[PDB]
Design an enzyme around this catalytic site. Structure first.
Site, short mmCIF file in Angstrom:
data_model
loop_
_atom_site.label_atom_id
_atom_site.label_comp_id
_atom_site.label_asym_id
_atom_site.label_seq_id
_atom_site.Cartn_x
_atom_site.Cartn_y
_atom_site.Cartn_z
N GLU A 1 40.88 65.02 32.96
CA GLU A 1 41.65 64.66 34.15
C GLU A 1 43.08 64.19 33.85
O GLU A 1 44.02 64.56 34.53
CB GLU A 1 40.89 63.61 34.98
CG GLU A 1 39.62 64.13 35.63
CD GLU A 1 39.81 65.16 36.71
OE1 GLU A 1 40.96 65.45 37.08
OE2 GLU A 1 38.77 65.69 37.19
N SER B 1 48.02 65.89 49.25
CA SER B 1 47.45 64.68 48.66
C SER B 1 47.88 64.61 47.21
O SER B 1 48.42 65.55 46.66
CB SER B 1 45.93 64.67 48.77
OG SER B 1 45.35 65.71 48.02
N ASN C 1 41.82 60.96 44.31
CA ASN C 1 42.67 61.60 45.31
C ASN C 1 42.90 60.74 46.53
O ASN C 1 41.99 60.07 47.04
CB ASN C 1 42.05 62.96 45.69
CG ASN C 1 42.87 63.74 46.67
OD1 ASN C 1 42.53 63.79 47.83
ND2 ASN C 1 43.93 64.32 46.23
N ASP D 1 46.62 62.95 43.24
CA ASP D 1 45.59 62.39 42.38
C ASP D 1 46.25 61.37 41.46
O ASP D 1 47.31 61.63 40.89
CB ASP D 1 44.95 63.47 41.50
CG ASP D 1 44.12 64.48 42.25
OD1 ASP D 1 43.77 64.28 43.41
OD2 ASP D 1 43.76 65.47 41.61
N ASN E 1 48.56 67.68 44.87
CA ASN E 1 47.67 68.79 45.21
C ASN E 1 48.33 69.64 46.25
O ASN E 1 49.25 69.21 46.96
CB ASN E 1 46.35 68.25 45.75
CG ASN E 1 45.66 67.35 44.76
OD1 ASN E 1 45.54 67.68 43.57
ND2 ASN E 1 45.21 66.19 45.23
N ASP F 1 47.32 70.56 49.06
CA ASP F 1 47.20 70.06 50.43
C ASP F 1 48.13 68.86 50.73
O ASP F 1 48.09 68.35 51.83
CB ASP F 1 45.73 69.73 50.76
CG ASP F 1 45.18 68.53 49.99
OD1 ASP F 1 45.90 67.91 49.19
OD2 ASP F 1 43.99 68.22 50.17
#
Ligand code: NA
Length: 129
Positions: A35, A50, A59, A52, A46, A48
């Site tokens: 990660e 959002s 997220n 992380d 991301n 969309d």
């Protein structure tokens, strides 16, 4: 902070992740490796909109508030910035909520794709724990 491998294993153990929801410590270390490369300050935006955050790339669509993810929730009741601290408490406590949420560690796509089913014990091999 960028943790060493064994350093993070030890910290995650101190913070109660070893065998949490049945997931051995190596699963958590493996997830963090892919990660964030063990970097608490990792962020990634991301598609969309959002973002992380942190060592487990938690997220903002569901888990933390960053003020710039429309329609999202804050189920861990934290600012997303808390997930970037050298102190892994916020990341760990939120991860505990996430992994209890229904699909276990499959919530972390990198865990599913890179850690699940592998010899995850290698991630803690040679560490004092
Ligand atoms: Na949010």
């Amino acid at each position: 902070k960028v943790f060493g491998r064994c350093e993070l294993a030890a910290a995650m153990k101190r913070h109660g992740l070893d065998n949490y929801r049945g997931y051995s410590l190596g699963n958590w270390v493996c997830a963090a490796k892919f990660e964030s490369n063990f970097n608490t300050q990792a962020t990634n935006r991301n598609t969309d909109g959002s973002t992380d955050y942190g060592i487990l790339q938690i997220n903002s669509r569901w888990w933390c508030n960053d003020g710039r993810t429309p329609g999202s929730r804050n189920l861990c009741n934290i600012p997303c910035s808390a997930l970037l601290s050298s102190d892994i408490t916020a990341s760990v406590n939120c991860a505990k909520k996430i992994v209890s949420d229904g699909n276990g560690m499959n919530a972390w796509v990198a865990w599913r794709n890179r850690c699940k089913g592998t010899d995850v014990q290698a991630w803690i091999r040679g560490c004092r724990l």
